[PDB]
Design a protein around this motif. Structure first.
Motif, mmCIF file in Angstrom:
data_model
loop_
_atom_site.group_PDB
_atom_site.id
_atom_site.type_symbol
_atom_site.label_atom_id
_atom_site.label_comp_id
_atom_site.label_asym_id
_atom_site.label_seq_id
_atom_site.Cartn_x
_atom_site.Cartn_y
_atom_site.Cartn_z
ATOM 1 N N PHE D 159 27.480 15.578 34.165
ATOM 2 C CA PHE D 159 28.852 16.067 34.082
ATOM 3 C C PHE D 159 28.794 17.574 33.858
ATOM 4 O O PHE D 159 28.548 18.051 32.746
ATOM 5 C CB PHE D 159 29.687 15.335 33.016
ATOM 6 C CG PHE D 159 31.171 15.671 33.196
ATOM 7 C CD1 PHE D 159 31.780 15.356 34.406
ATOM 8 C CD2 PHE D 159 31.911 16.273 32.202
ATOM 9 C CE1 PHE D 159 33.128 15.661 34.564
ATOM 10 C CE2 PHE D 159 33.255 16.589 32.370
ATOM 11 C CZ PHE D 159 33.861 16.287 33.585
ATOM 12 N N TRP D 160 28.998 18.302 34.961
ATOM 13 C CA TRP D 160 29.001 19.759 34.860
ATOM 14 C C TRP D 160 29.981 20.337 35.879
ATOM 15 O O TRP D 160 30.461 19.636 36.769
ATOM 16 C CB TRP D 160 27.585 20.287 35.076
ATOM 17 C CG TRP D 160 26.908 19.841 36.341
ATOM 18 C CD1 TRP D 160 26.025 18.810 36.440
ATOM 19 C CD2 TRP D 160 27.025 20.369 37.681
ATOM 20 N NE1 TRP D 160 25.579 18.648 37.727
ATOM 21 C CE2 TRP D 160 26.195 19.612 38.502
ATOM 22 C CE3 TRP D 160 27.760 21.414 38.261
ATOM 23 C CZ2 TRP D 160 26.034 19.818 39.873
ATOM 24 C CZ3 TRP D 160 27.602 21.622 39.626
ATOM 25 C CH2 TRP D 160 26.757 20.839 40.412
ATOM 26 N N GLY D 161 30.306 21.626 35.744
ATOM 27 C CA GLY D 161 31.219 22.243 36.690
ATOM 28 C C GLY D 161 32.678 21.993 36.365
ATOM 29 O O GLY D 161 33.573 22.340 37.152
ATOM 30 N N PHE D 162 32.965 21.390 35.193
ATOM 31 C CA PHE D 162 34.363 21.212 34.829
ATOM 32 C C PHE D 162 35.022 22.496 34.338
ATOM 33 O O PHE D 162 34.364 23.499 34.057
ATOM 34 C CB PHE D 162 34.512 20.140 33.738
ATOM 35 C CG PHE D 162 33.466 20.223 32.632
ATOM 36 C CD1 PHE D 162 32.207 19.690 32.751
ATOM 37 C CD2 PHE D 162 33.847 20.873 31.464
ATOM 38 C CE1 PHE D 162 31.312 19.789 31.680
ATOM 39 C CE2 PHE D 162 32.977 20.969 30.399
ATOM 40 C CZ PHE D 162 31.722 20.422 30.534
ATOM 41 N N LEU D 163 36.341 22.490 34.238
ATOM 42 C CA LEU D 163 37.140 23.612 33.768
ATOM 43 C C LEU D 163 36.736 24.027 32.355
ATOM 44 O O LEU D 163 36.604 23.179 31.472
ATOM 45 C CB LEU D 163 38.627 23.244 33.802
ATOM 46 C CG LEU D 163 39.593 24.382 33.476
ATOM 47 C CD1 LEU D 163 40.847 24.241 34.342
ATOM 48 C CD2 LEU D 163 39.976 24.432 32.003
ATOM 49 N N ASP D 165 37.781 26.790 29.314
ATOM 50 C CA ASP D 165 38.745 27.725 28.760
ATOM 51 C C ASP D 165 38.678 27.658 27.236
ATOM 52 O O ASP D 165 37.685 27.156 26.689
ATOM 53 C CB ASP D 165 40.148 27.459 29.317
ATOM 54 C CG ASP D 165 40.815 26.182 28.889
ATOM 55 O OD1 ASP D 165 40.234 25.448 28.046
ATOM 56 O OD2 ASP D 165 41.965 25.891 29.329
ATOM 57 N N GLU D 166 39.697 28.159 26.574
ATOM 58 C CA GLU D 166 39.626 28.340 25.120
ATOM 59 C C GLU D 166 39.698 26.990 24.402
ATOM 60 O O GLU D 166 39.535 26.966 23.181
ATOM 61 C CB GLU D 166 40.696 29.287 24.593
ATOM 62 C CG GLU D 166 42.130 28.908 24.832
ATOM 63 C CD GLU D 166 42.715 29.251 26.187
ATOM 64 O OE1 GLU D 166 41.989 29.433 27.170
ATOM 65 O OE2 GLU D 166 43.970 29.327 26.229
ATOM 66 N N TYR D 167 39.932 25.918 25.146
ATOM 67 C CA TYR D 167 39.978 24.598 24.497
ATOM 68 C C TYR D 167 38.693 23.824 24.672
ATOM 69 O O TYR D 167 38.563 22.677 24.233
ATOM 70 C CB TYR D 167 41.158 23.791 25.084
ATOM 71 C CG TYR D 167 42.492 24.388 24.722
ATOM 72 C CD1 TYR D 167 43.169 24.043 23.566
ATOM 73 C CD2 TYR D 167 43.084 25.322 25.577
ATOM 74 C CE1 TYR D 167 44.396 24.590 23.236
ATOM 75 C CE2 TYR D 167 44.298 25.875 25.258
ATOM 76 C CZ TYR D 167 44.951 25.515 24.101
ATOM 77 O OH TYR D 167 46.166 26.098 23.828
ATOM 78 N N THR D 168 37.688 24.410 25.318
ATOM 79 C CA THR D 168 36.520 23.697 25.740
ATOM 80 C C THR D 168 35.321 23.900 24.822
ATOM 81 O O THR D 168 34.976 25.060 24.627
ATOM 82 C CB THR D 168 36.076 24.184 27.150
ATOM 83 O OG1 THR D 168 37.192 24.023 28.037
ATOM 84 C CG2 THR D 168 34.910 23.364 27.666
ATOM 85 N N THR D 169 34.729 22.813 24.328
ATOM 86 C CA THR D 169 33.485 22.905 23.578
ATOM 87 C C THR D 169 32.385 22.115 24.240
ATOM 88 O O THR D 169 31.187 22.265 23.941
ATOM 89 C CB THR D 169 33.637 22.379 22.132
ATOM 90 O OG1 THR D 169 34.149 21.047 22.233
ATOM 91 C CG2 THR D 169 34.653 23.163 21.319
ATOM 92 N N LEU D 170 32.751 21.210 25.169
ATOM 93 C CA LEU D 170 31.755 20.331 25.745
ATOM 94 C C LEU D 170 30.680 21.070 26.518
ATOM 95 O O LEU D 170 30.994 21.872 27.415
ATOM 96 C CB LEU D 170 32.450 19.326 26.684
ATOM 97 C CG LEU D 170 31.574 18.294 27.397
ATOM 98 C CD1 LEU D 170 30.958 17.301 26.428
ATOM 99 C CD2 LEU D 170 32.426 17.570 28.432
ATOM 100 N N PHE D 258 26.358 9.855 21.879
ATOM 101 C CA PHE D 258 26.132 11.265 21.547
ATOM 102 C C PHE D 258 24.689 11.531 21.150
ATOM 103 O O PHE D 258 24.085 10.713 20.473
ATOM 104 C CB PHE D 258 27.012 11.693 20.382
ATOM 105 C CG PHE D 258 28.480 11.938 20.625
ATOM 106 C CD1 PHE D 258 29.002 11.835 21.912
ATOM 107 C CD2 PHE D 258 29.305 12.275 19.588
ATOM 108 C CE1 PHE D 258 30.352 12.083 22.088
ATOM 109 C CE2 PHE D 258 30.655 12.521 19.753
ATOM 110 C CZ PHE D 258 31.165 12.424 21.047
ATOM 111 N N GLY D 286 36.789 8.535 26.779
ATOM 112 C CA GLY D 286 37.527 8.869 28.002
ATOM 113 C C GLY D 286 38.109 7.633 28.650
ATOM 114 O O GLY D 286 37.586 6.525 28.533
#
Ligand SMILES: O=c1[nH]c(=O)c2nn[nH]c2[nH]1
Ligand SMILES: O=c1[nH]c(=O)c2nn[nH]c2[nH]1
Ligand SMILES: O=c1[nH]c(=O)c2nn[nH]c2[nH]1
Ligand SMILES: O=c1[nH]c(=O)c2nn[nH]c2[nH]1
Ligand SMILES: [Cl-]
Ligand SMILES: [Cl-]
Ligand SMILES: [Cl-]
Ligand SMILES: [Cl-]
Ligand code: NA
Ligand code: NA
Ligand code: NA
Ligand code: NA
Lengths: 295, 295, 295, 295
Positions: D159-163, D165-170, D258, D286
């Motif tokens: 899982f890579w290449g997702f959006l 922004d300032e909400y993202t930690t993954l 995890f 998810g």
């Protein structure tokens, strides 16, 4: 092939929030479980491994906690609206946000007859819920509900006059037990957006309170001709007491309690007027549903 | 080979009983789930296909309903004693009866501020239980309990001063959430038989009430040093208030609520003194247990 | 008052471990849920708020993962022994460790008839479990079990010749359905410590396999006189096939399937020899238990 | 007010059926849970206490067993069609029947390598389901599904290449665990009535088999770019293999596992390439959904 419909996000997000009054020492808690599913121009994540269009569900989870930190989480109708509005406004290409919220009960304890400032009891598995669908260009559709409200009346329930044919064994009765788990949903007029939702904030707790009160009072006072007839009365009254509601839906199981004939044992009489001991039936159960609207 | 131990019977027997006051119209309901397992000279049913020694579990079910028809079903300590005593007296070759009873809540509804004569609400999944072991020649041993009592306090819980070594990551805290599902059991002095149980009937509801009251008040008022320390106080007090109890047992999960560091997002402060939004953890959970007796 | 018994720790610790064969590419997964409860000189945590004697349950959780990282997690009897031995050896004042492990099924998928190197299916909710009690000065006591093994036979089950008196309504039958959820436990000879457990490692998977095989074969082939008689045969055989086992315990519900008399409808015959449609009963259920040992 | 929608009937009707081959001695069992809800000219039961329009739900239960006695219960698509067709034809004033069926697994046991004639094992909680809506004047709409199919792959998920922004930690990942509970639904072309359903009977088991096979093979062989991309491939293939299907729907939770950083303990390496022990996360998860149709 092609994508006819798609939505994705994070489910079962548990959230707790506490409010502390600095001056009084009184604390108030809220606990909910949240699901947020998004729709939009995301078909290529499915058809082309294009993850650029995906707001990660992990980020949707983060956003749920951040939104709870920065806004009120009550009434759940407002929180869900704020949350769903954020996604469609923040992301151009996201055009709908579907927010389901389950609110869990944390009722302040009374200790020695005085409300305690920071201890709570889960005084029921009954839930207060919202389903908030935020659709860009089409406002906010909210369904509010109560569920898991488990009740029993030991008399003043009847069931007779039903259809009788070669498939029928049920005896007519003029005095039976009625027990159900109440699932009741009130569907609001479409709201044009977040301002209109906010303009009605007080009505959300008030209407939930009315729905519960009308449910319990009708259940207790209606000498019921059937589940059908009783639930319609509940719905009718709720509609009459809040004009911003368009429909009221009930989904009610009839959780049967069967008489037990014991006359085979020493002529013991436990049926009809002598019925004292009953066997609750786990399954099957009747399931009765109604959606009531304005004529 | 040989049978070292054996017991058999019927589990999950749902029972409802209603009491109707003819004069007032007030009805009262009881609902429970019953298990009765018998022991005795039954080894040959297992080793020799000798079913002559088997009281069928279907008959044990019938007997449960008949006993409920012919006796009070409250307090559950008394009902279980009557029920278990019946099997060991009725059947020479049965020498013990193990009766577990789960009582389900049916609390009278208040409608427009007045108690309703025949409508009830399940105002919690909290249970009142009994385990009654009736052993021929050795009286009746009763364990009474409350379970499923789910509570939360949002402050006045601490955990510091614990052992710290190379396996330790937990931060000491002077202000945390404490939430648990209370399982509390009080074990009665052996009773010589049914008469002695009956001679103490009033104490059963009284002691259950005391245990609940002491649980809730201690939970709410103890500025808790740990689950261990708080639960001991509960047990100590219950023992001090009923001399016919020999031990008090608690089994408590620590249902953790974790802080959420959000400073990665616009420097948001949500930890320590600024902690408002928490993530309830479904698993794992601490599990803390204590049996307290008289010194 | 005083502490008569105490144990505390972390429950519901979910653990996954993967083993990767570098050379073959074949991966193997294990998933379990672990509970570790400790006993020792910990009474003062309860009576004096002395947390110095507490190994935090959070640290017990960390220790579970570290132990899984540094040792084999299979067979679960060995892992539990390693884990429990660690606590009593690491902490002078801890004198017993109680380790319960639930192993979850992850069976390798066959794709186009060939075992896949890294994809698995949960091919049942059946569990393989261990209870390992590690007691300083007194070795290691292990109970191994299988549980959740749900089976049905549609004929070759009988129940007749049971006790008949004024409480009996059950008809004798020479041909009925038998369905149960198998809970079977084999209790091992005490082991003096970790070396002795290790010396028997191969027997743990072998005995679990034997117990399952004997359970399924006896269930399928015994023209059963009763649950009692059938389960005894299972236990007898398991004991005969592993001398390091001292007792074998079964706990079996009889999940009843009732005939449905339909002759009231157009004389339809659905009973006895004509019985084709049955109603599975969720509750009540018989519960039959046996512990078998060596004569 | 007025009734905008209404349906009522019996839910959670457990049904078992056995088929006995007289000549071979081979018996075959089917177990299901059935819900039948009816619609029609029944508004007056709700608004006027007119129970004459009610086919009692108890009679709907009787009818379910009678229909199972007189017809095949397999494939569930056909049984549901027969059942729903009965209500709308038998009762003039009933105009739709909604039949949901959950089929439970009873797989024949192999004993000593030979299929046993009358003993079965529940070799999974995976379900095969149907939703059959029989609407007078408008034929029969069938949705078939498999659900509860729980799978895990320990690598070949990315899982890579997702959006971001300032909400993202993954963190992006090129090698992760993927585990889900498969809910897959195939929606059939409308059928004009019972004859047309019968004309396609063989396709129902075949299509269920194809859907399962394609699900498992794609899951195991797709080096997955995301849940989205993998589930689309499954749906695409199923559509290509049965022209009588109009859409294929998947509903998939991403049940996260995890990594556990243990480097704080003696520099233990358990992340990235050294990751062996993981913590399965019960919640949140998810939830990814897709409905795929023909272009
Ligand atoms: O209230 C009821 N409604 C029904 O439709 C019904 N059918 N059986 N019993 C019933 N009771
Ligand atoms: O009250 C507590 N007791 C314990 O033993 C513990 N361990 N971790 N957190 C804890 N909290
Ligand atoms: O196998 C059985 N054992 C029992 O003890 C019993 N009692 N009722 N039916 C039964 N079947
Ligand atoms: O497969 C995935 N899809 C998603 O949309 C996602 N979001 N976070 N992790 C994810 N994994
Ligand atoms: Cl009903
Ligand atoms: Cl803890
Ligand atoms: Cl039984
Ligand atoms: Cl996801
Ligand atoms: Na948008
Ligand atoms: Na006796
Ligand atoms: Na020690
Ligand atoms: Na019709």
């Amino acid at each position: 092939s092609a994508v006819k419909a798609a939505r994705y996000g994070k489910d079962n997000v548990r959230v707790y929030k506490v409010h502390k009054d600095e001056k009084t020492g009184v604390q108030t808690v809220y606990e909910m479980t949240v699901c947020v599913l998004l729709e939009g121009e995301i078909e290529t994540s499915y058809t082309k491994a294009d993850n650029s269009v995906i707001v990660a569900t992990d980020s949707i989870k983060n956003t749920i906690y951040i939104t709870a930190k920065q806004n009120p989480v009550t009434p759940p109708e407002l929180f869900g609206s704020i949350l769903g509005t954020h996604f469609i406004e923040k992301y151009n290409h996201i055009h709908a946000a579907h927010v389901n919220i389950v609110c869990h009960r944390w009722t302040r304890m009374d200790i020695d007859g005085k409300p305690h400032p920071h201890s709570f009891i889960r005084d029921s598995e009954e839930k207060r819920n919202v389903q908030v669908d935020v659709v860009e260009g089409k406002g906010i559709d909210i369904k509010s509900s109560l569920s898991g409200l488990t009740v029993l009346k030991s008399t003043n329930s009847q069931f007779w006059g039903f259809l009788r044919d070669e498939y029928t064994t049920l005896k007519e009765t003029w005095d039976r037990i009625l027990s159900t788990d109440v699932d009741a949903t009130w569907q609001w007029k479409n709201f044009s957006g977040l301002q209109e939702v906010r303009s009605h904030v007080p009505k959300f707790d008030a209407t939930w309170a009315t729905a519960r009160e009308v449910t319990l009072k009708t259940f207790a006072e209606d000498n019921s001709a059937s589940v059908q007839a009783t639930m319609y009365k509940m719905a009718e009254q709720i509609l009459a007491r809040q004009q911003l509601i368009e429909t009221v839906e009930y989904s009610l199981p009839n959780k049967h309690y069967f008489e037990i004939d014991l006359s085979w044992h020493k002529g013991l009489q436990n049926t009809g007027k002598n019925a004292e001991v009953f066997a609750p039936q786990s399954d099957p159960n009747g399931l009765i549903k109604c959606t009531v609207g304005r004529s």
